[PDB]
Each structure stands twice: as structure tokens, then as C-alpha cells.
Design a binder for this molecule. Structure first.
Ligand SMILES: [Mg+2]
Length: 853
RNA sequence: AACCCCUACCAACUGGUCGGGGUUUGAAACCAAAGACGACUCGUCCCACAG
RNA sequence: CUGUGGGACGAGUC
């Protein structure tokens, strides 16, 4: 550990790679401001990790905002730009006139605040609010009660402010853009902090109660053999249990490190199977616990001790040092060798294991955890399980990478430190630990609470159709009021329980209702081709036979295609009338529940199919949302660099302004006058003597003055000369520069702007049902999504387009399939980044998993 | 495997082979999540039916 | 407070 530990790795130390975007200096100035560009390459990687977390946050916040807007259903964006600002408290929001001093005495602002308060009151009165059971509702006793208006307004305004921070990229919008999330402590009021603390404290109290109801087991041995006081042992055991896997710890402790021991003279645990028969369990746990405790104690004593040493005498703990050693290995046997003698160096706890072999509360509340973690937990309450898992896993991985880089940097010799504007990342280890702890319980809790009449209305709509307001009476007089005109029913509500347990309790239906209208979700599900495609995808997983046996069970050999067709026919034409006519079977119980089980399985299959369709559509849309967010971020970065790019006119002129700036010399103008200026290709040809390897073959032997030299070589030299003026390394390649310049001459700014706006607004998920019956073949969700998007664009601006875009629209209308050329024209704004342009415009590199085809 | 970089051969060099690299490319190092439905084991919670 | 079934979540393999 003398002046270097693992500093010889090529990843940490190496020549400056001159990143393709060319924004490394600008990013370092904005985030660090005191780093040397040509000395290291770790700060740029940290900034890239920050950019990745910004992208993933933008995606998930856009999804959550769309879900909230869909749930509200007031034809106006409740969460958006200029609505529900975080700078206004609940008292000012409810009474803007009495608190006019806070609104800088603006009449229009006060009127807007009053309108927003009316909208918030209507949203609170909306029975659909029960879908966000974990956010706007709390469980007190048996039933769920509505939280106070202060907390609901705090949550809504915090989400709106986070959405503003996602797409602000401004200099003065009553907030500090790009750092509001990183400075929540000095920007949020006390009410928002209290609301976040209460939301965290509910779950922490539930976890403490659950642990105390089952803490009698661990206290018998963990708190006795090791001599740890039980009061300060529950937290340690909980942290060990959450972080006993390779996902969080970073290295194997139980499966490999634990078995690496017990091979020495202390093999009595494994060899003597008589006494060590029913006690090996929890003894392996004790060994893992002591190893984890030693590692975390070493990490904690190394941390908070190198703070005194400014930059040089800082040390690195064995934690993540073992991880760096493992990552340097490139073979399975090398990992075993690394674990070997590492189990011996770590074997300084001989007394602890000797005591172990003789074997036969307070939790961190919201006041201690960071505001970012509480805000992320609140955001997860608007998403669903897979989305929560993906977002939190990405966040913890990126924060772990940032922590590792920030620990490595002092050893390398980099003195770069965050300015007092992005100092939130200086404690990335605590943020990652809190995010892991939050992920440990983010899946807990009932997603839907306080089942109302509107929920059963939506359940009927997603199942049946061909009804009207008559369904209101058909629900009221059958589900809750059947004993008399208005008296509640006895324990004879089996139909209501069936509906709840088969629709409301299912998370797939919650995902559907968060992003789609149940009637529209029923209308889309009636398409035979899409259902057959989903069933084929399910079959290709390597399930159709199981579904057929559990739904249309017939003990006889049948073809897979026949079973898929039968399942499609069952799914197609789904109606609530079949369940309504057989309510007697539903209300019965016993061995005759075969029909009930078949109905449950059919409903589950239908919900699974439609949920898969919706999830694929929203993921594909979110990819382009991320792409446009990256485009806007890069536009901001290039503007800060010093290039002539207008950010205010970016939306008016389309998001291709970055591509035009990076292309080089402007050409999209009637008064070009650049061909005469680009006549330096002749001088370049005359100066070909510098390249002594090409001159004997270019114009000395293989001249071909007829067509190759004159018509082809001169044009290629002109194109290369236009390419050498590119401001980005991606477009410095002649091929990509020529492709981008050719594409820039056919794009329509209005079409690109509309496509970006509808991608951000997730407009495809609204008209997917309407624009799905006019498709000849559904090869993949990519083609489906892009055909729907092109159909929406046509329906908006068919008559307001001219040129090749009109030809592409006509081709889409005639040939019912997505247009690749139109897709390239729409992805032209992504053209400055070649991999992003190719992935988002070609149906061969878009999906990571579909690369096998 | 899309993109970028490196050694060698060749090559308008906007092209190919030979190998190596890429957390500093792209949802994109590794793990993990998703794709991906479904099955089993160990613990917790909730719901329904009974005393 | 005690039993029988279903659902959700934490941990690993197909
Ligand atoms: Mg990256």
C-alpha cells in the first residue's frame, strides 16, 4: 500500500482517449472545474455514470408522470411544466391571495395557482386515486384512509418538480436547474422533508415490527456467541442479510469464500457429521456474518480516516480491493487462485471461528437517510415491480462505480474535487447503501388500496364491452347492495372477492390501468395476429401446453399451432357476460370449482398477454425518450462549449440542430456558396505527395481518368473535405458524414418536433388500440410501435407535408408497414451519435435480446 | 455484434483479413434487472372460509 | 386466539 496498490491497471491509468463527443473538457469544467484533461481518464467516466443515472431517471420520471396524467384523466397535464412547483408550500398553494407576498404580486400567477388548486381538489375527489395506495393512502387498522391534503400536495409537487428538473436545462426558471435534485436539502421546504420522512418511517416501522415478531431466532446465537448486545445487533443483522450476496457485496462470501475455509485442521465442522448435523445451518450464517462484519469494519475504519490526509497519504480498504483483484482476472481458475490465500490473509479471526465452533429495535429513519433516497423511494411508488427493480439496480450499479472511481482517484494522483454545486456525489457510498436498503422493501405493500366502484367498472370494461351507464347499476345492485335497496351485504360477496382477487390484486392489471384505458385495452386484445404473436413469443421462451391444459384441458396429443389458435380464440372476444351468467358457480366453493379455476386461468392469461404488449410498447417508447433527452443534454453541452447553437429555437427547428452543428459547414440554405469554398479538394489532390504509399497507385498507375479519377475521385475528395470540417468525432468519418448530410436535406422540422413531443408524451400507448387493426403482419414490437407512431404522425400532419416525407406517408398508408427511410429521417436528430442513430433506426441492433436473429 | 481505437498485410484510405482493447460508444465492463411466461425449496405479510 | 386454501414479497436453481 506504499504510494500505489492497483494503480498499474490500464483502466485507471492510460493515455487520454479523446472521447468521441469532444465534450470532456466542458463536462470536467461543469462538474469539477479543476481537473487536468490530458492527465487522467477517470473523471470523464464518473461524469458518464452521472449522465447514465440522469438518463434512467428521466425515463422513469417521464413514465411516472404519464401514469399520473392517465390516472387523473382531466384532459390536462396535472404533472408537467409550470404546474405544481415545489417552491410553493401547501399553505400558499391553498391560499394564494393571503400569501400574495410569496407570489411576487402577480395576478396571472395567483389565478394559475387557484386553477391548480381546483384541479388538485378534483384529483383528490377522483375515485381513481386508490390505484396509488402506497402514495396517497395509509393503512390504519383494517381499512385504508386518505392521507392529509398537505402530504398529497407535497408528493404531487415534488414529482412535478422532479419532472421539471428532468427537462429544465435552463438558467432561471424559479429553480436551480441540473442541481435541484442534488441539492434537495437547501431547496425543499420542511413540509416535503416531513412527508418523505413519514413515507419512509411507515415502512421502517412495519419492518421493525415484522423483525421483532421473528427476532427470537437470531438473538439465540448471533447475539450470544459473538457477545454482541442485542440492541445494536438487529441493525447489523439486517444489513448483513440485505448485503450477503454478490449483487451488493461485490464478491462471493457464502458460496465460495465460506467453503474456501473449513479445509484446514478446523475441518471438524464438515468431517464430524454427527454433532454437526442440524447445527451447520446458522453456523454457516455465523461465519458469513463475522466475515461481513470484519469487511464492513475495515471499510468504515479506512473511511473517515483518510479525510485528514488531503490527497497523497489516502489508503484503500481491502473491500473493493478484492473486487479490483477479481475483475483483473480473466479466467475461472484465476478467480479461485485469487480467493486462495485471500481466505488466509483474511484469516486473522481465528478466535472468532474458534468461539463459533463451540456452538453446540433501532433502524435508520427518514431523518438520517438522504433526501435523494427518500425521493427515489417516493418515485418508485408510482412505478411497478420490474420498473422499480431495473431503475434501482441501474442506480446502485452506477453509484458503486462512482464510489470505486472516487476511491481510486487519490491513489492515481488526481486532485479533482466536486465544486460546491454537485457535492451530492461525494457521498456515493451512503447513497448506494440507502438505495439497496430501499430496494430491499420497495416491492412490499399493496399497490392498490380502498377498492372503489370505479375499480370494478374498469375491471368490467377490460373484460367485457357493449355496455353503458347501465353497468353502474349492474355493479351497485349486485356487488355491494343486493340484500336490500341500499343495505350492505352479508358474507355472501363471493363475486366481489373473485373480481378483486383476479383483477385488482394482480399487478399486471395495475400496470395496465396505469398506462392504458381498460376499454381500449380490451379493444386492442381482440386482434388475432397480435395475440398469436404473443403466444408464439411465449412458446419460444422454452408453456403453451400448460396453458392449454389449465384452460382448455384435453388429454390428447395436439399440434402447438392448434393450441395457440385455441388460446387465441379464447382470448379474442373476451366478455364479462360469460362470467355474469355463471355467477352461481363463482359463488360456490368446494371440489366443483373447476369452472372457477378455468376462469381464473383464462383471466390471468388475458391479463398477461395485454400486459406484455403494453410493457413492450412503453419500453420501446422510453428508449426514444432517453434518446431525445440525450439529444437535449448534448445540445446544452455544445452550447456551453462555445459553439453557435440556439437552444430556444431547438424545438422550432427540430432536434437535428446538434446534427447540423456536428456535421460541419452549413449546407441547408438556399444561398449555399460553399461548393466554390470547398474547392480545396483540388489542393488536397495536388498535395497527395505527402502520402507516398497511395500516390503510385492513385494517379500514377491506376489513373482511370475517364470515370474513376474525374467523376468519382473528385466527388469523394469533396465529400471527405466536407467531412474533415465536422465538429464531432462520430461524423469525422466520411461515410457517416455523407449519410447525415444526405438525410438532412429531406427532413421536416415539424415532423421531427411532433415525433419528439409524442414520444415524450407517450402518445403511442393511447392510440395503440386504434392503429393496430390496420396491420397486415406483426413481426415484432418494433415494427408495431413505429407503424403506430407513423400513423399518428400522418393523422396529425398528412396534408401539411410535401416532398419525400409525403411519399413515405403514402407508402405507409398503402403498404401497411413501417417505413425504414421515414424512420431514418425521424432519427436524424440522433445522427450526431452514430451508435444511437443506428440502434434506434435499424431493426437489427435495437433490442439487445433480439440480436440472436 | 453495432461503433471506436491499436499491431501487421493490403487498400481512396467511406474498403477487407489477422489478432488485441473499449465503465472514457450505444438500455450496453462484470454481477444483477429486463427480455420472461411458468415450476420447486425455505421465511414474512395480506385475503377468503370455519371454530 | 386456532386450522385449511389463494395472492404478494425476501433468498437460489431451471
Ligand atoms: Mg457509458
Amino acid at each position: 500500500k506504499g504510494y500505489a496498490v492497483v494503480a498499474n491497471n490500464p483502466l485507471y491509468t492510460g493515455p487520454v482517449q479523446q472521447d468521441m463527443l469532444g465534450l470532456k473538457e466542458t463536462l470536467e469544467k461543469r462538474y469539477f472545474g479543476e481537473s487536468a484533461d490530458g492527465n487522467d481518464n477517470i473523471c470523464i467516466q464518473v461524469i458518464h455514470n452521472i449522465l447514465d443515472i440522469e438518463k434512467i431517471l428521466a425515463e422513469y420520471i417521464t413514465n411516472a408522470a404519464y401514469a399520473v396524467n392517465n390516472i387523473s384523466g382531466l384532459d390536462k397535464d396535472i404533472i408537467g411544466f409550470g404546474k405544481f412547483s415545489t417552491v410553493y408550500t401547501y399553505d400558499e398553494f391553498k391560499d394564494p391571495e393571503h400569501h400574495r407576498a410569496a407570489f411576487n404580486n402577480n395576478d396571472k400567477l395567483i389565478n394559475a395557482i387557484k386553477a391548480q388548486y381546483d384541479e388538485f381538489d378534483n384529483f383528490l375527489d377522483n375515485p381513481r386515486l386508490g390505484y396509488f395506495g402506497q402514495a396517497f393512502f395509509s393503512k390504519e387498522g383494517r381499512n385504508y384512509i386518505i392521507n392529509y391534503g398537505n402530504e398529497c400536495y407535497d408528493i404531487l409537487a415534488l414529482l412535478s418538480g422532479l419532472a421539471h428538473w428532468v427537462v429544465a436545462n435552463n438558467e432561471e426558471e424559479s429553480r436551480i436547474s441540473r442541481t435541484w435534485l442534488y441539492n434537495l436539502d437547501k431547496n425543499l421546504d420542511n413540509e416535503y422533508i416531513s412527508t418523505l420522512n413519514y413515507l419512509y418511517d411507515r415502512i421502517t416501522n412495519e419492518l421493525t415490527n415484522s423483525f421483532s415478531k421473528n427476532s427470537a431466532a437470531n438473538v439465540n446465537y448471533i447475539a450470544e456467541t459473538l457477545g454482541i448486545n442485542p440492541a445494536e445487533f438487529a441493525e447489523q443483522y439486517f444489513r448483513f442479510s440485505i448485503m450477503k450476496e454478490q449483487k451488493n457485496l461485490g464478491f462471493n462470501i457464502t458460496k465460495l469464500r465460506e467453503v474456501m475455509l473449513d479445509r484446514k485442521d478446523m475441518s471438524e465442522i464438515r468431517k464430524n457429521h454427527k454433532v454437526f448435523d442440524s447445527i451447520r445451518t446458522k453456523v454457516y450464517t455465523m461465519m458469513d456474518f463475522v466475515i461481513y462484519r470484519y469487511y464492513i469494519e475495515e471499510d468504515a475504519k479506512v473511511a473517515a480516516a483518510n479525510k485528514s490526509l488531503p490527497d497523497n497519504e489516502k489508503s484503500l480498504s481491502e473491500k473493493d480491493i478484492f473486487v479490483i483483484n477479481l475483475r483483473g482476472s480473466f479466467n475461472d481458475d484465476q478467480k479461485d487462485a485469487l480467493y486462495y490465500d485471500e481466505a488466509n490473509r483474511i484469516w486473522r479471526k481465528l478466535e472468532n471461528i474458534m468461539h463459533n465452533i463451540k456452538e453446540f429495535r433501532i433502524l435508520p429513519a427518514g431523518r438520517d437517510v438522504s433526501a435523494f433516497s427518500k425521493l427515489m423511494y417516493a418515485l418508485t411508488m408510482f412505478l411497478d415491480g420490474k420498473e422499480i427493480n431495473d431503475l434501482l439496480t441501474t442506480l446502485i450499479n452506477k453509484f458503486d462505480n462512482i464510489q470505486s472511481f472516487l476511491k481510486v482517484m487519490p491513489l492515481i494522483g488526481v486532485n479533482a474535487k466536486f465544486v460546491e454545486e454537485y457535492a451530492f456525489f461525494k457521498d456515493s457510498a451512503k447513497i448506494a447503501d440507502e438505495l439497496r436498503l430501499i430496494k430491499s422493501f420497495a416491492r412490499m405493500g399493496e399497490p392498490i388500496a380502498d377498492a372503489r366502484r370505479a375499480m370494478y367498472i374498469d375491471a368490467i370494461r377490460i373484460l367485457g364491452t357493449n355496455l353503458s351507464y347501465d353497468e353502474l347499476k349492474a355493479l351497485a345492485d349486485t356487488f355491494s347492495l343486493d340484500e336490500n335497496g341500499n343495505k350492505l351485504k352479508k358474507g355472501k360477496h363471493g363475486m366481489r372477492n373473485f373480481i378483486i382477487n383476479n383483477v385488482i390484486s394482480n399487478k399486471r392489471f395495475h400496470y395496465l390501468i396505469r398506462y392504458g384505458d381498460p376499454a381500449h385495452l380490451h379493444e386492442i386484445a381482440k386482434n388475432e395476429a397480435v395475440v398469436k404473436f404473443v403466444l408464439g413469443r411465449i412458446a419460444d421462451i422454452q408453456q403453451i401446453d400448460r396453458y392449454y391444459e389449465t384452460c382448455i384441458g384435453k388429454d390428447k396429443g395436439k399440434s402447438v399451432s392448434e393450441k395457440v389458435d385455441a388460446l387465441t380464440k379464447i382470448i379474442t372476444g373476451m366478455n364479462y357476460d360469460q362470467f355474469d351468467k355463471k355467477r352461481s358457480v363463482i359463488e360456490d366453493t368446494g371440489r366443483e370449482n373447476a369452472e372457477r379455476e378455468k376462469f381464473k386461468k383464462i383471466i390471468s392469461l388475458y391479463l398477461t398477454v395485454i400486459y406484455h404488449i403494453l410493457k413492450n410498447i412503453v419500453n420501446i417508447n422510453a428508449r426514444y425518450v432517453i434518446g431525445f433527452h440525450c439529444v437535449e443534454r448534448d445540445a446544452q453541452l455544445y452550447k456551453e462549449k462555445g459553439y453557435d447553437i440556439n437552444l430556444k429555437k431547438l424545438e422550432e427547428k427540430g432536434f437535428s440542430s446538434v446534427t447540423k452543428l456536428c456535421a460541419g459547414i452549413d449546407e441547408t440554405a438556399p444561398d449555399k456558396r460553399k461548393d466554390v469554398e470547398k474547392e480545396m479538394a483540388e489542393r488536397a489532390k495536388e498535395s497527395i505527395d505527402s502520402l507516398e504509399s497511395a500516390n503510385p497507385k492513385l494517379y500514377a498507375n491506376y489513373i482511370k481518368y475517364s470515370d474513376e479519377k474525374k467523376a468519382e475521385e473528385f466527388t469523394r475528395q469533396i465529400n471527405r473535405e466536407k467531412a474533415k470540417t465536422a465538429l464531432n468525432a462520430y461524423l469525422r468519418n466520411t461515410k457517416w458524414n455523407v449519410i447525415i448530410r444526405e438525410d438532412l436535406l429531406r427532413i421536416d422540422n415539424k415532423t421531427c418536433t411532433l415525433f419528439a413531443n409524442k414520444a415524450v408524451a407517450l402518445e403511442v400507448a393511447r392510440y395503440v388500440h386504434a392503429y393496430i387493426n390496420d396491420i397486415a403482419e406483426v413481426n415484432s414490437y418494433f415494427q408495431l410501435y413505429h407503424y403506430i407512431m407513423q400513423r399518428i404522425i400522418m393523422n396529425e400532419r398528412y396534408e401539411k407535408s410535401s416532398g419525400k416525407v409525403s411519399e413515405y406517408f403514402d407508402a405507409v398508408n398503402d403498404e401497411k408497414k413501417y417505413n425504414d427511410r421515414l424512420l431514418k429521417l425521424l432519427c436524424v436528430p440522433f445522427g450526431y451519435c452514430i451508435p444511437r442513430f443506428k440502434n434506434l433506426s435499424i431493426e437489427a441492433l435495437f433490442d439487445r435480446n433480439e440480436a440472436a436473429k
